[PDB]
Amino acid sequence: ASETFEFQAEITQLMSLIINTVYSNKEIFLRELISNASDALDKIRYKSLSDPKQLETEPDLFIRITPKPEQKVLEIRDSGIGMTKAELINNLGTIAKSGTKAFMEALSAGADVSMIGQFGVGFYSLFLVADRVQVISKSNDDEQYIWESNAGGSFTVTLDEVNERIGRGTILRLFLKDDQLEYLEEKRIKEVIKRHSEFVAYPIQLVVTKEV
Ligand SMILES: NCCCOc1ccc(-c2cn[nH]c2-c2cc(Cl)c(O)cc2O)cc1
Secondary structure, three states: OEEEEEOOHHHHHHHHHHHHOOOOOOOHHHHHHHHHHHHHHHHHHHHHHHOHHHHOOOOOOOEEEEEEHHHOEEEEEEOOOOOOHHHHHHHHHOOOHHHHHHHHHHHHOOOOHHHHHHHOOHHHHHHHOEEEEEEEEEOOOOOOEEEEEOOOOEEEEEEOOOOOOOOOEEEEEEEEOOOOHHHHOHHHHHHHHHHHOOOOOOOEEEOOOOOO
């Protein structure tokens, strides 16, 4: 069962700009996604204090990055609180309206794209290196769902029936642009991670497949 929704105008406009903008330091995208993953983890951690049973679906709290060269895909996973179907719809397709509108105005005034995080809409920076994204999420309060968008003004939400079932959390599956495959490389990914992840209180796992 697939369902389609339209983004709030302001969000679509920001996405159009980001996916086409010529930025020379696109690696900032990872910083934003790592920060969001950390926030999701803090949320499940906090809630587990009085309700530890919430952790049983996925006992370990972590962030995991897995590049998939064969598919020109980069996955950023966290075992955070996750998002129900309603949360995916609202969080990624509506609530960012004000932040995106303000950031667009900031950019028009000369702001740098690296300021996106200051406006609470860092998520959309992924379109600097990807032309399509699948958000696979599993909240303890709902079934596993897939949110997907290619920056076409609309997005779809589908009951996950093809991906691996995760205990709890969210996976950002980025379909990298042909000229942004450097982020599939271990060395490159490692340097980008260490450059801004000093604050992360959770372990950041890197899964790489190398031939011996
Ligand atoms: N104004 C700042 C916006 C960031 O705030 C958050 C931070 C985390 C979440 C949240 C809850 N469950 N999953 C997420 C979540 C959201 C995004 Cl976009 C992400 O890349 C990873 C996540 O784990 C939701 C909102």
